[model samples]
Target: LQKEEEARKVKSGIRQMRLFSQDECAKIEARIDEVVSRAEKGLYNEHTVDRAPLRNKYFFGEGYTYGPGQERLYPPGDVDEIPEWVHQLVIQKLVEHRVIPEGFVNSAVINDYQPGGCIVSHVDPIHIFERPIVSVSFFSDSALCFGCKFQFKPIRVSEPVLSLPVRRGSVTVLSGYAADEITHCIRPQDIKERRAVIILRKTRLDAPRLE
Candidate 1:
């Protein structure tokens, strides 16, 4: 019976689900869309798609870069102000997880996607901030293709797997090494429609200056 017992299958990992009310999701989405739209119209000095030299291509000890479209920080405060509901959602998540403390998230990165658009796989280092990175998805049906495997080559990890399925009106909070070094990104819809995603990063007083 040892072989039979071994054959029995069991699954366990860190993929969890949480829900948000329609009304709550709507408000955040509407505001995010409006502000993100405006920012898209703004001129940025960077490009998300540019191959740096082999050495500079990868993020060094504590420095990194963003897409040209991602000029300024997320939200910009002026266009898309952080709503109370957004903060509430985050704090509640912290309380529910009981892993992180209650505080403010200062920076945000807003990305607008149309059908056929996608973010390349990359990592977000903790040197950016001490608090966890909060990502809120708003508007349009969402499908995030997150895994540790790289399309160019095969890279694997055992603990804190990098598999994430981001749905519409959902929030993803990443912390620990799992949050720091994972090639996570979203796949674009095939249809001709607009989608919005907001990433909130808790700013640190000791954080390094932006380049």
Candidate 2:
């Protein structure tokens, strides 16, 4: 297992590049405005830890909702469909790049961040999602850090950290060891600019099935 893991790391399983033009990125951002508006109008509430609200809105397949830790599948009252622009533009382009399989993507999480907003480091469950956990950054650039060590429940430290600059209009895909062996996060930015990220993923066979 160690040998195989080492082999996987030798060739980066992480793919990052600018996949959309500035005009296209702007269009996607506009569509997101509609989605966020719906979620804001009582479709959802603030998701926070320790009274600090997380700026996120989730859109999943017909019967599923945002599972905070991506550990359990929740059925919130009304889970909206991912917007048309996402499928027509973003997902289509992703499929063309072969980063995501055609029709494999069914869920999305959109996060809007202000200067101080940041994501805590955590791994997407290796058994609960398909390869190439995909995210696109919009508005401004941000840093995503990965680590090979961590602790659970109370959420502790990590080692051998790797940092990547996810620029505006760029798409990042994580698979193989990058998806399974490392935890990733975005630290709070000191810049005053706002940024948004859209993550698209396919549910793994082991993930909970929603009714």
lDDT of 1 by residue, 1-211 (tens): 5323322211121233445557767876776555445445653223321232211111111223453333232222222344455556544664466534555555445666656666656666454565466666656656554443444444543321233556666766665544543455554432235665666666555554543
> Which residue pairs overlap in candidate 2's backbone?
none
Which candidate ranks first by TM-score, i.e. highest?
2
* lDDT assessment of candidate 2: 0.69
Q: Write the per-residue lDDT of candidate 2 for residues 1-211, one digit (tens) a residue.
A: 5544554582387888889999998998888777667655655433211123646545454233233654554443345566677889899999998877889887777778767777666777654677778999998888876663442333564432566788999998888877877676676652247888888988666677444
The deviation in Å at residue 69 for candidate 2 is: 6.8
How displaced is residue 203 in candidate 2, in Å?
Answer: 0.2
Candidate 2 has its poorest 10 consecutive residues by lDDT at 43-52
Error of 1 at 113 (Å): 1.3
Clashing pairs in model 1, backbone N/Cα/C closer than 3 A:
46-68, 47-68, 48-67, 48-68, 74-108, 74-109
> Which candidate number maximizes lDDT?
2
